[PDB]
Design an enzyme around this catalytic site. Structure first.
Site, short mmCIF file in Angstrom:
data_model
loop_
_atom_site.label_atom_id
_atom_site.label_comp_id
_atom_site.label_asym_id
_atom_site.label_seq_id
_atom_site.Cartn_x
_atom_site.Cartn_y
_atom_site.Cartn_z
N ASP A 49 0.84 -1.20 0.00
CA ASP A 49 0.00 0.00 0.00
C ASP A 49 0.87 1.25 0.00
O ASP A 49 1.85 1.33 0.75
CB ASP A 49 -0.87 0.12 1.26
CG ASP A 49 -1.91 -0.98 1.40
OD1 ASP A 49 -1.63 -1.98 2.10
OD2 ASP A 49 -3.01 -0.85 0.83
N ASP A 60 -2.78 20.21 -1.77
CA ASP A 60 -3.02 19.83 -3.15
C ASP A 60 -1.75 20.04 -3.97
O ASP A 60 -1.12 21.09 -3.91
CB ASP A 60 -4.16 20.67 -3.75
CG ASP A 60 -4.50 20.26 -5.17
OD1 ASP A 60 -4.79 19.07 -5.39
OD2 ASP A 60 -4.48 21.12 -6.07
N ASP A 97 -6.64 -3.67 11.29
CA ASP A 97 -5.82 -2.53 10.88
C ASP A 97 -4.94 -2.04 12.03
O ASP A 97 -5.43 -1.66 13.10
CB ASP A 97 -6.71 -1.40 10.36
CG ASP A 97 -7.01 -1.51 8.87
OD1 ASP A 97 -7.10 -2.65 8.36
OD2 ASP A 97 -7.16 -0.47 8.21
N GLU A 141 -8.51 14.67 -8.52
CA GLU A 141 -7.52 14.17 -7.56
C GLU A 141 -6.83 12.85 -7.94
O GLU A 141 -5.60 12.76 -7.88
CB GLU A 141 -8.16 14.02 -6.18
CG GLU A 141 -8.75 15.31 -5.61
CD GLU A 141 -7.80 16.49 -5.71
OE1 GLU A 141 -6.60 16.33 -5.42
OE2 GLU A 141 -8.27 17.58 -6.08
N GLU A 144 -4.57 13.44 -10.90
CA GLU A 144 -3.30 14.08 -10.59
C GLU A 144 -2.37 13.16 -9.79
O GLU A 144 -1.17 13.11 -10.04
CB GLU A 144 -3.54 15.39 -9.83
CG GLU A 144 -4.39 16.38 -10.62
CD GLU A 144 -4.75 17.62 -9.83
OE1 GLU A 144 -5.16 17.48 -8.66
OE2 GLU A 144 -4.64 18.73 -10.38
N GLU A 172 -11.25 -1.70 -1.50
CA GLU A 172 -12.21 -2.52 -2.23
C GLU A 172 -13.33 -1.70 -2.84
O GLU A 172 -13.78 -0.71 -2.26
CB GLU A 172 -12.78 -3.57 -1.28
CG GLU A 172 -11.70 -4.23 -0.46
CD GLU A 172 -12.23 -5.24 0.53
OE1 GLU A 172 -13.00 -4.86 1.44
OE2 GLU A 172 -11.85 -6.42 0.39
N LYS A 287 -10.03 -4.42 -6.53
CA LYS A 287 -10.52 -5.47 -5.65
C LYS A 287 -12.01 -5.47 -5.38
O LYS A 287 -12.65 -4.43 -5.26
CB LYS A 287 -9.82 -5.41 -4.29
CG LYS A 287 -8.31 -5.51 -4.34
CD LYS A 287 -7.74 -5.62 -2.93
CE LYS A 287 -6.21 -5.57 -2.95
NZ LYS A 287 -5.62 -5.64 -1.58
N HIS A 292 -19.32 -12.49 2.58
CA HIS A 292 -19.93 -13.81 2.68
C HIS A 292 -20.98 -14.04 3.77
O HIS A 292 -21.61 -15.08 3.80
CB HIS A 292 -18.83 -14.84 2.87
CG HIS A 292 -18.05 -14.65 4.14
ND1 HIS A 292 -16.94 -13.84 4.21
CD2 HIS A 292 -18.27 -15.12 5.39
CE1 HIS A 292 -16.51 -13.81 5.46
NE2 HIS A 292 -17.29 -14.58 6.19
N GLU A 367 -7.00 -13.55 -2.75
CA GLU A 367 -6.29 -13.37 -1.48
C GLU A 367 -7.04 -14.12 -0.38
O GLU A 367 -8.17 -14.57 -0.57
CB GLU A 367 -6.26 -11.89 -1.06
CG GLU A 367 -5.99 -10.89 -2.15
CD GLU A 367 -5.88 -9.48 -1.60
OE1 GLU A 367 -6.64 -9.15 -0.65
OE2 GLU A 367 -5.05 -8.70 -2.12
N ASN A 368 -6.40 -14.24 0.77
CA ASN A 368 -7.04 -14.88 1.90
C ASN A 368 -7.60 -13.70 2.70
O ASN A 368 -6.98 -12.64 2.76
CB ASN A 368 -6.03 -15.69 2.74
CG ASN A 368 -4.81 -14.88 3.15
OD1 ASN A 368 -4.01 -14.46 2.31
ND2 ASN A 368 -4.66 -14.67 4.45
#
Ligand SMILES: OC[C@H]1O[C@H](O[C@H]2[C@H](O)[C@@H](O)[C@@H](O)O[C@@H]2CO)[C@H](O)[C@@H](O)[C@@H]1O
Ligand SMILES: OC[C@H]1O[C@H](O[C@H]2[C@H](O)[C@@H](O)[C@@H](O)O[C@@H]2CO)[C@H](O)[C@@H](O)[C@@H]1O
Ligand SMILES: OC[C@H]1O[C@H](O[C@H]2[C@H](O)[C@@H](O)[C@@H](O)O[C@@H]2CO)[C@H](O)[C@@H](O)[C@@H]1O
Ligand SMILES: OC[C@H]1O[C@H](O[C@H]2[C@H](O)[C@@H](O)[C@H](O)O[C@@H]2CO)[C@H](O)[C@@H](O)[C@@H]1O
Ligand SMILES: [Ca+2]
Length: 516
Positions: A49, A60, A97, A141, A144, A172, A287, A292, A367-368
């Protein structure tokens, strides 16, 4: 694999980097050594990431790609490849996270209305990512950011294997329908996120544009709306998910709602391609989340997916093919349950998405969803990845295998494989008109002894009178297999006398010949 095919010859395994920047975990030297180790275990590249909050923090057009550049430098020193995710969403707040990187604070001042963020059925405001309704701001955005990134990373084009885009929360393409603060965390039903004044206004105009006037609207919906202002999103999401979705209003609402994400997909796909195609010439993808839970809930069917924006996957994927974006799905490590109260069906969901993607000819990656601490989960991933034509698999996350040698070893054997084309030949098969010969074996790349869905079909050779075929196999791994005959009606008639094996499958293309 499915449809008598074998595994995808382009399969490659990737490693998800940590959420925290490398300097917050270890030093660059150790990092480079970790990469060399990962590469030795089958990893082709490291996916990482690059947060918007970091790259354009001050203001900006005030960019900082120094971290990104330094990161790519070490990837280069280690002889590895990388897949940057241009993360235009917030880091922190989502499940698992371990970070705090909101998007640039100044971006919020570009509007006085409530067009930039989300608002749920019950008023909860969310600012994890820009509302895709604000396509004008997003065009400016992202446009740019993407172009600045391309220029700043041009020197590293040779280490970039692919580029991933962030289409919403957690990167996602979806609405932020399941959050703690909104009371919609797993495994509860999600809440629709189109209650800002701006969202209501857009839905209203979309409806009116479709039917022309209120009278035509009422005619189509079979309603008695008093005025245009009565055109609104569902007042009660639960009742809407219980049976309102079945009405003509419901179908229109969901069409518009999912439609916003599809248009967003086309927008970022265009910006991304315009910014990277000439400079990098690498695939670009996005993504799709694996929502589920509440999948088979009888009271509120697909009660988590719909609010997230997923109503018609076929239609959703068409947006991907259209934007020329590969698809990355998740939950490949899970199995179906479908019982109260989660009503979770991750595997069925994955099978459905894979099938659809294959039909439309869309490059599929996976991915898992959660950390894997057991070999059994690797097998689930392998079964899905090698039997549904996945082109790539990314393991979340770095520390899980980098600091667990036994785990890293199981991954190398089961998932960190290199596909190699091999010829399988079988002689003296007593086939009669109408029969066909297939092979099935112990590894997932061979169908795991399944004769129903995953067997690999061979082809008769009228000249040498034997059955053969070029099959993709996992290099340097031991395999066992047996050919068998299938009737016209699909009944297994008989098996090869002795079980065959290749210990291991050679690295170079050659042939394995055996007799019935
Ligand atoms: O915009 C019309 C109307 O939509 C909503 O009502 C829906 C309801 O959400 C569905 O479950 C089903 O019952 O159809 C209704 C429309 O007939 C809003 O709740 C309502 O405020 C709005 O006027
Ligand atoms: O962050 C988005 C993420 O949400 C889901 O992950 C679930 C997980 O599957 C559940 O077992 C539980 O831990 O809650 C998590 C977050 O609510 C999706 O499974 C995943 O595809 C998606 O990316
Ligand atoms: O259950 C999978 C099983 O498949 C093969 O065994 C065959 C055998 O070769 C046939 O002669 C006949 O007995 O049907 C069996 C399948 O039920 C593999 O040889 C075996 O290793 C594998 O477990
Ligand atoms: O670094 C990749 C992303 O990781 C998290 O999001 C994951 C989440 O951990 C996983 O449970 C889910 O199934 O997939 C998402 C998407 O990869 C972070 O929350 C994201 O911000 C990161 O982009
Ligand atoms: Ca800017």
């Amino acid at each position: 694999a499915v449809n008598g095919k074998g595994m995808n010859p382009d399969y490659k395994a990737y490693l998800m980097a940590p959420l925290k920047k490398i300097p917050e975990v270890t030093n660059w030297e150790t990092f480079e050594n970790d990469l060399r180790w990962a590469k030795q275990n089958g990893f082709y590249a490291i996916m990482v990431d690059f947060w918007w909050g970091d790259m354009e923090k001050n203001g900006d057009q005030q960019f900082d790609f120094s971290y990104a550049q330094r990161f790519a430098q070490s990837v280069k020193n280690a002889g590895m490849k990388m897949i940057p995710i241009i993360s235009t969403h917030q880091c922190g707040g989502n499940v698992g996270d371990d970070c705090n990187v909101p998007i640039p604070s100044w971006v919020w001042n570009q509007k006085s209305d409530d067009s930039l963020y989300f608002k749920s059925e019950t008023g909860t405001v969310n600012k994890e990512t820009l509302n895709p309704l604000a396509s004008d701001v997003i065009r400016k955005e992202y446009g740019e950011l993407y172009t600045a990134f391309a220029a700043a990373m041009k020197p590293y084009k040779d280490v970039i294997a692919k580029i991933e885009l962030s289409g919403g929360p957690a990167g996602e393409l979806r609405y932020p329908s399941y959050t703690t603060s909104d009371g919609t965390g797993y495994p509860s039903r999600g809440k629709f996120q189109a209650y800002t004044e701006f969202a209501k206004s857009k839905f209203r105009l979309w409806v009116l544009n479709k039917y022309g006037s209120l009278n035509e609207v009422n005619k189509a919906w079979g309603t008695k709306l008093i005025s245009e202002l009565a055109i609104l999103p569902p007042s009660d999401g639960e009742q809407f998910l219980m049976n309102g979705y079945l009405s003509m209003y419901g179908k229109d609402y969901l069409e518009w709602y999912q439609g916003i994400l599809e248009n967003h997909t086309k927008l970022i796909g265009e910006l991304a391609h315009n910014a990277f195609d000439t400079t990098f010439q690498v695939p670009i993808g996005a993504k799709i989340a694996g929502v589920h839970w509440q999948y088979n809930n009888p009271t509120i069917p697909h009660g988590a997916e719909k609010p997230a924006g997923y109503n018609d996957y076929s239609h959703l994927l068409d947006a991907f093919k259209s934007a020329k974006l590969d698809v990355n799905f998740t939950c490949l490590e899970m199995t179906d349950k479908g019982s109260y109260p989660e009503y979770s069906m991750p595997k069925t969901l994955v099978q459905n998405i894979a099938t659809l993607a294959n039909e439309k000819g869309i490059v599929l990656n996976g991915e898992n969803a959660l950390s894997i601490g057991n070999e059994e989960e690797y097998k689930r991933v392998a079964e899905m990845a090698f039997n549904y034509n996945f082109a790539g698999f990314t393991l979340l996350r770095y520390q899980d295998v980098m600091y667990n040698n036994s785990l890293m070893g199981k991954f190398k054997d089961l998932l960190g494989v290199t596909p190699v084309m091999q010829t399988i030949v079988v002689k003296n098969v007593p086939t009669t008109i109408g029969d066909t010969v297939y092979i099935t074996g112990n590894r997932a790349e061979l169908g795991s002894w399944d004769t129903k869905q995953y067997p690999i079909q061979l082809y008769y050779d009228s000249h040498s009178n034997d059955w053969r075929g070029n099959v993709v196999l996992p290099a340097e791994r031991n395999i066992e297999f047996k050919a068998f005959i299938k009737s016209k009606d699909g009944t297994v008639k008989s098996w090869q006398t002795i079980q065959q094996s290749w210990n291991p499958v050679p690295l170079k293309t050659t042939s394995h010949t055996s007799s019935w």
